[model samples]
Target: TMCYSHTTTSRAILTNCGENSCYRKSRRHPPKMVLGRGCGCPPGDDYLEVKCCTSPDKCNY
Candidate 1:
């Protein structure tokens, strides 16, 4: 499962999620950032979602 949240700070482009599957896979598989596509925030916004699919097939949404 994947969960996302927004922050009220101004130091980063997106929120900082705690240790999660996305973080773990990022260290191991490292999916390319498909910005402006997939499960991300609206364009020109200061937020981003877990940029990968949570389906059984791992296909990006």
Candidate 2:
């Protein structure tokens, strides 16, 4: 499945993902997209949001 792998820390550009999906930890994102193994994101900011997709092209950007 294709997923968005853009992040605020390093990869700030929109792109597709591999085995893991993508995640957007911001307010102006398309959704709470995440490229996690267990469909979950790391803990840090409380204002940050997250989400994960499984189907092909589910979270693809």
Candidate 3:
């Protein structure tokens, strides 16, 4: 069997998720999880784990 891995990037600024106070303060919007292809993954194979935030306060971050 083969195994695959994944990674995520934030479009909006990340407020939470273990970010430091200074880092969070610099951000104007909440965290938005965007999909990115892992080392062995294809472009179309990428999927959304956490959708983008509609508003700053809407997301946990």
Candidate 4:
């Protein structure tokens, strides 16, 4: 699948999960297993946010 992926302090990027699905490395317990489709950072390494999505190309945008 094609996954929309990106991080704070950087531009957006599209990822190809050849044989897997999309996910995010969160800042909480379990570090977040899944991801929605959007980007809205709050601030700080403990507060900033970034997410991923599994859908049509660039779905997270």
Candidates in order, TM-scores: namely: 0.17, 0.36, 0.17, 0.35
Candidate 3 residues 1-61, lDDT tens each? 1111123234433333222111111122336333332222122212323233222332322
Query: What lDDT score is found at residue 7 in candidate 4?
Result: 43
Q: In candidate 2, which residue pairs clash?
A: 21-35, 22-34, 22-35
**What are the lDDT figures for the candidates, one per model?**
0.30, 0.44, 0.26, 0.46
Q: Against the hidden true structure, what lDDT does model 3 obtain?
A: 0.26
Clashing pairs in 4: none
Cα error, candidate 2, residue 9 (Å) = 19
The C-alpha stretches of model 3 lying farther than 4 A from their native spots are: 1-48, 56-61
lDDT assessment of candidate 1: 0.30
What stretches of model 2 exceed 4 Å from their correct place?
A: 5-14, 28-40, 58-61
Per-residue lDDT for 1-61 in model 2, tens only? 4444544324544344456654434433456544332222445355555555555563533
Candidate 1 stretches greater than 4 Å from native? 1-45, 51-54
Candidate 1: tens digits of C-alpha lDDT, residues 1-61:
3322322222334323223222111212335333332233232323333344343322322
At residue 36, candidate 4 shows an lDDT of: 38
Q: What would the TM-score be for candidate 4 when compared with the true structure?
A: 0.35
As for candidate 1, its clashing pairs are none
